[PDB]
Amino acid sequence: EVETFAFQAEIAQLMSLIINTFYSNKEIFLRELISNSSDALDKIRYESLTDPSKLDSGKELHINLIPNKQDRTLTIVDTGIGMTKADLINNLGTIAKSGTKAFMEALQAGADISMIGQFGVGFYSAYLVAEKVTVITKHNDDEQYAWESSAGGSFTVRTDTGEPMGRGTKVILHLKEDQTEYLEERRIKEIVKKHSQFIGYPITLFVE
Ligand SMILES: CCC[C@H]1Cc2c(C)c3c(n2-c2cc(Cl)c(C(N)=O)cc2O1)CC(C)(C)CC3=O
């Protein structure tokens, strides 16, 4: 079964701003997704200290960047804490609402789109380069889910029947036709070096 949900008004407004505002510095989407992966990895690592059984779903703490020119996708994989069904549907959208209001107020005041991460809504910067975003996630206390949205005010959540992940999150970016530069090895390496050189987890850039 595929469940369809409406984004809260502020999130739909945020997504429309990201998709419609003329802003050439699109490359910042990668640092935002890597930062979310790094934060998710910090969470599981901290949780594992009081409960070692939380790493029974995988001991390796890493980030993989997987470009696919045939499917026109850039996948960001992490072995972080993952997200529950409640996180995908309600929890994160609720925390994102306040961050969204503050960000849109800052943009009106003179701030730029690159500052999105300071408002904890950096995940939505994925819509700078992607026409559709698929999020495959597995949290220790829940099942594997697939979240998906092409914006337009709605998202879907379904139980994932694909390849089991153990634990973590896969962000599949279905790139816009004119954003294929983010599938190029040299381009991804340049972006990682410029904005994510001090991330405390190994970042492996897969090759085609
Ligand atoms: C609590 C701060 C971190 C948030 C930030 C965040 C927000 C805010 C939202 C999402 N994320 C988010 C994304 C990813 Cl891909 C990861 C990860 N790699 O584990 C962790 C995330 O949680 C994804 C969403 C639930 C589909 C929509 C949303 O509003």
Could you explain how this protein is built, in words?
- This protein has helices at 9-20, 28-50, 85-109, 185-195; strands at residues 2-6, 63-68, 73-78, 130-138, 144-149, 154-159, 168-175, 203-205.
- The protein has 208 residues and is α+β, with helices and mostly antiparallel strands.
- The protein has one domain (1-208): Heat Shock Protein 90.
- Strands 1-6-5-4-7-3-2-8 form an 8-stranded mixed sheet, covered by helices on one side.
- A hairpin with a 5-residue loop joins β4 and β5 (144-149).
- The longest helix is centred in the middle third of the chain and has 25 residues, at 85-109.
- Residues 1-208 are annotated as: Interaction with NR3C1.
- ATP binds at residues 36, 78, 97, 123.
- The modification N6-acetyllysine is found at residues 43, 69.
Small-molecule binders: the ligand CCC[C@H]1Cc2c(C)c3c(n2-c2cc(Cl)c(C(N)=O)cc2O1)CC(C)(C)CC3=O
- Beta strand count: 8
Instruction: Profile the largest sheet.
Output: 8 strands, mixed
Beta-strand level of the residues, as a percent range?
15-25%
CATH top level is Alpha Beta
CATH topology category name: Heat Shock Protein 90
| Tally of separate domains | 1
Find the structural class using helix and strand composition.
alpha+beta
Q: State the separation between the terminal residues, measured CA to CA.
A: 34 Å
Please tell me what the overall shape is: globular
Summarize the helix and strand pattern as letters: EHHEEHEEEEHE
User: For this structure, what is the CATH homologous superfamily?
Assistant: Histidine kinase-like ATPase, C-terminal domain
Percent helix range:
25-40%
Kindly provide the radius of gyration, computed on alpha-carbon positions and rounded to a whole number of angstroms.
Answer: 16 Å
Gross CATH architecture: 2-Layer Sandwich
